[PDB]
Design a protein around this ligand. Structure first.
Ligand code: 8GD
Ligand code: MG
Length: 291
C-alpha cells in the first residue's frame, strides 16, 4: 500500500524568511509538518490542516514544491509539499510535536535530517515564496449541452457539480482566495457561489472569458487575465474548458514555467503563483472529488 500525505515548508516574515522545523519525540527527529489525507480530503486542505495540528499556525499555501516518495514499513509514503506563509496562531506542544524552531533556510537545511525534506527545502529556496495567487477554476459538472432545453448560457451545475462547488470552498480558502471573477455563464458563477458566501464577497462577471469570447478574441482575454492578476488580493477566476488550456499554456510559455502536473477537468484548479508581476508557479489540482 502507498500512503498519500501532504505537508508544507511553513515560513514566516520575522519582521526576513524563517522556516519552521518540528521535533517529534516518537522518532526523535526534525522534519517538515505533514500528515495523511482524511477521506474525501484534497492534498492542499490536508497540508493546511496538518500545519495547524502540528505547529498551531494558520497559513496560506502558495507555490507547490513537488512530491517525495520514500519507503516506510507499511510500503511507500508519498507526500505533496507546498510553501505556506504563517498568517497567525502560535506553537502549542501536541501529541506528536514537542518542539518547533524557526530558522533561516541555511540553518534549517542543517536541522533537517531526512534527504527528502532537504530536497523540498531546496525547491522552496529556488524561487520567490512571498507570492500572490491567481486561482483559475474550471466550473463544476453541469450536464450536457446536447440535452439542455433553454439558453445554454443558463445551464446550471448538476448535483455532482454543486458538490464540487461546496468542496472548492476549503480548497480555495487554503490558498487565501479573496476576490471572485466568473465568465458570463451560470455554471461558472454557481461554481464559486459557495465561496462567495464564505467570503461574503460579490462575483465580478467576465464577458471576455467565455468560450465564445475567447475563441473570437484571445488577446482581449489574455489582457483581462493580466489586469485581474495585477489587482491587490488573490483572485479566483472561474471559466470554461476551451479557455483555460490556452491561457495557462500561453502564460507558462511566456514566463518559462514548467507545470509538474496538467489536466483540464471540470472542478479542477490551476494555482498561478506570481512574484512582482512574474509567474513563478503553475500548479494543476484535480477536482476535489477525483484522484
Ligand atoms: N518526515 C519524514 N520522515 C522520513 C523522511 N524520510 C524517511 O526515511 N523518513 C522516515 C521517518 C520514519 O522512519 C518513517 C516514517 O515516517 P513518517 O513518514 O513521518 O510517518 P509517520 O508520521 O510515522 O506515520 O520514514 C522524510 O523525508 N520525512
Ligand atoms: Mg505528521
Amino acid at each position: 500500500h502507498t500512503v498519500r500525505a501532504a505537508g508544507a515548508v511553513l515560513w514566516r516574515d520575522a519582521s526576513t524568511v524563517e522556516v519552521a522545523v518540528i521535533h517529534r519525540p516518537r522518532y526523535d527527529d526534525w522534519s517538515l509538518p505533514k500528515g495523511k489525507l482524511d477521506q474525501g480530503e484534497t492534498e492542499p486542505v490536508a497540508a493546511a490542516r496538518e500545519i495547524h495540528e502540528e505547529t498551531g499556525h494558520t497559513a496560506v499555501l502558495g507555490r507547490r514544491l513537488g512530491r517525495v516518495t520514500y519507503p516506510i514499513p507499511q510500503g511507500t509514503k508519498r507526500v505533496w509539499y507546498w510553501a505556506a506563509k504563517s498568517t497567525g496562531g502560535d506553537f502549542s506542544p501536541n501529541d506528536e510535536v514537542d518542539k518547533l524552531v524557526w530558522l533561516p533556510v541555511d540553518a534549517a537545511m542543517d536541522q533537517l535530517q531526512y534527504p527528502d525534506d532537504r530536497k523540498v527545502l531546496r525547491r522552496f529556496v529556488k524561487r520567490p515564496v512571498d507570492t500572490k495567487t491567481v486561482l483559475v477554476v474550471r466550473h463544476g459538472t453541469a450536464g450536457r449541452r446536447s440535452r439542455y432545453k433553454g439558453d445554454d448560457r443558463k445551464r446550471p451545475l448538476d448535483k455532482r457539480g454543486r458538490a464540487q462547488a461546496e468542496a472548492l470552498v476549503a480548497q480555495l480558502m487554503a490558498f487565501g482566495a479573496t476576490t471572485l471573477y466568473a465568465a458570463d455563464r451560470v455554471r461558472c458563477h454557481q461554481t464559486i457561489e459557495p465561496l462567495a458566501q464564505e467570503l461574503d464577497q460579490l462575483i465580478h462577471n467576465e464577458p471576455l472569458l467565455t468560450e465564445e469570447a475567447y475563441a473570437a478574441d484571445h488577446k482581449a482575454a489574455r489582457k483581462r487575465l493580466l489586469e485581474i492578476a495585477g489587482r491587490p488580493g488573490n483572485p479566483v477566476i472561474c471559466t470554461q474548458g476551451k479557455v483555460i488550456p490556452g491561457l495557462i499554456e500561453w502564460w507558462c510559455e511566456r514566463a518559462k514555467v514548467r507545470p509538474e502536473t496538467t489536466g483540464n477537468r471540470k472542478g479542477s484548479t490551476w494555482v498561478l503563483s506570481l512574484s512582482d508581476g512574474e509567474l513563478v508557479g503553475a500548479d494543476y489540482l484535480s477536482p476535489p472529488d477525483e484522484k
